[PDB]
Design a protein around this ligand. Structure first.
Ligand SMILES: OC[C@@]1(O)OC[C@@H](O)[C@@H](O)[C@@H]1O
Ligand SMILES: OC[C@@]1(O)OC[C@@H](O)[C@@H](O)[C@@H]1O
Ligand SMILES: OC[C@@]1(O)OC[C@@H](O)[C@@H](O)[C@@H]1O
Ligand SMILES: OC[C@@]1(O)OC[C@@H](O)[C@@H](O)[C@@H]1O
Ligand SMILES: OC[C@@]1(O)OC[C@@H](O)[C@@H](O)[C@@H]1O
Ligand SMILES: OC[C@@]1(O)OC[C@@H](O)[C@@H](O)[C@@H]1O
Ligand SMILES: [Zn+2]
Ligand SMILES: [Zn+2]
Lengths: 89, 89, 89
């Protein structure tokens, strides 16, 4: 079925991250001003949303991956992807 | 059917808002730096998107809730959710 | 099927762009503080996401339009929409 994307950007270059839910798997493509490349994020999901914010020049990213009625938060704080404290209720 | 989410964030703490369209109903979870709690937003929708912007330290949120071919805009400007002027045509 | 939207905003007025994927067609509605109107963007797609950034006072917008397993990026840089370099792999 048709894939589903979510996008975020930061700075003025800019950096862009595009997340794609594709048949149960979410992957990440990256732009930092000089070509698209595959990012490290790879987790299960039928649906994806994202938001990001800067603290100074350090980017923080939250990706929300949903399967069925279960949503899992993934956190990027500059040094690795980790599961977040988000709960749905 | 998997639920569908949309997310926005502001500031450096940050504040995060996650909207979940769950089989026709959109609810909202909130992070302001010290735990996830349920927000005031409760409206019908199969699909949801969001954007937000700061005027000084005041957050303004716009949520776009879609059912069928009807999209309703909901506005947070500090003191309650109100229907916005958005129309598709 | 219910339509699916993506929203972005910039400035303090603000300007808002809302993209709606509606049965294969993505269209755009615009707010610059003085009423909603229809924007130039009109391209095919079953799913849509968007991000934007400012460089000074100039807005740059990226719309990710997906049909099947194909995602096409559309770029606004002040002077018309053009296809972007985004690729999924
Ligand atoms: O520089 C690329 C990278 O480290 O940027 C932050 C996140 O997007 C990561 O998944 C990604 O691999
Ligand atoms: O740094 C991780 C974290 O504390 O960031 C704020 C929220 O995203 C939380 O759910 C998350 O666990
Ligand atoms: O402090 C929580 C709250 O008031 O923040 C602004 C909006 O997200 C509201 O729906 C939400 O209840
Ligand atoms: O104050 C509310 C409002 O004027 O804000 C800007 C746009 O979101 C409009 O649709 C909306 O009615
Ligand atoms: O002034 C309206 C407009 O030029 O703004 C930038 C883009 O949203 C365009 O599609 C749109 O027509
Ligand atoms: O100016 C257009 C462009 O170079 O902007 C940055 C990225 O969005 C690229 O995919 C895109 O082609
Ligand atoms: Zn279901
Ligand atoms: Zn339909």
């Amino acid at each position: 079925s048709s894939v589903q994307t979510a996008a975020t950007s930061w700075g003025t270059v800019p950096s862009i991250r595009v997340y794609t839910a594709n048949h149960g798997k979410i992957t990440e493509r990256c732009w930092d001003g000089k070509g698209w490349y595959t990012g490290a994020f790879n987790e299960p999901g039928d649906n994806v949303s994202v938001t990001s914010w800067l603290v100074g020049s350090a980017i923080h990213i939250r990706v929300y991956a949903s399967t069925g009625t279960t949503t899992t938060e993934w956190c990027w704080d500059g040094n690795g992807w980790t599961k977040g404290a988000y709960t749905a209720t």
